[PDB]
C-alpha cells in the first residue's frame, strides 16, 4: 500500500481536486490523477521539488497568492478568488488540483464559492467547508462565501460537472 494522497485530499467534482501542500511522498499519488493544472493559493514561491514535479509531469501552475491570516484578522481578497474561479471553470484546465498550505481556509473559500455557482444552499456549502476545516473552521471564511457576488459568472456553463 504505497500511495499517499496529500494533506486533506478530496475530489470536489469531475476533474477538480482539493488538498493542502503536496510533498514528494504524495507525487506518485498525484501522478494517478493526470493533472493538467494546479491552482496554488499561497504567495510563497513553489519549492524546487514541487517545481520539478510540475515540469516533469506537464502540469501548469496558476498562482493566486492569498495572505494566510488567522481570525479575527482574516480579509480574503475577492479579486484573487474571482481570478481562480475563472481558471477553475475552464474545463481545458481539468484535471486541476486546488491547494493552499492546509487545504482548509483559502482552498475551502474557493471551493465554497464554486458550490454557490453550482446552486448549493449555504448550510450545505458550510457543512462541506467545516468537514475539512474541523476545529480550525473560520466564521469569516463562511461569511466570505455568504456575501461573494456570483453575478459576473451567471453565463459560464458547467457541463464538466457530475451535477447537471
Numbering used by the authors: 51 to 214
Can you quote the paper on this entry?
Here, we provide the ligand/enzyme crystal complexes for one such PTP outlier: Arabidopsis thaliana Plant and Fungi Atypical Dual Specificity Phosphatase 1 (AtPFA-DSP1), herein unveiled as a regioselective and efficient phosphatase towards inositol pyrophosphate (PP-InsP) signaling molecules. Although the WPD loop is missing its canonical tripeptide motif, this structural element contributes to catalysis by assisting PP-InsP delivery into the catalytic pocket, for a choreographed exchange with phosphate reaction product. Subsequently, an intramolecular proton donation by PP-InsP substrate is posited to substitute functionally for the absent aspartate/glutamate general-acid. Additionally, we conclude that the hydrolyzed phosphate remains trapped as an enzyme-product complex, until it can be released in a prisoner exchange with another PP-InsP molecule; the latter process is assisted by the WPD loop.
The oxygen atom that is positioned at the apex of the phosphate ion’s tetrahedral geometry points away from α4. This oxygen makes a hydrogen bond with the unprotonated Nδ1 of His155 (we will return to this point below). We denote this orientation of Pi as pose A, i.e., Pi(A). The three other oxygen atoms of this Pi are intensively coordinated by amide groups of P-loop residues Lys151, Arg152 Lys154, His155, and Arg156. The side chains of Arg156 and Cys150/Ser150 also make polar contacts with Pi(A).
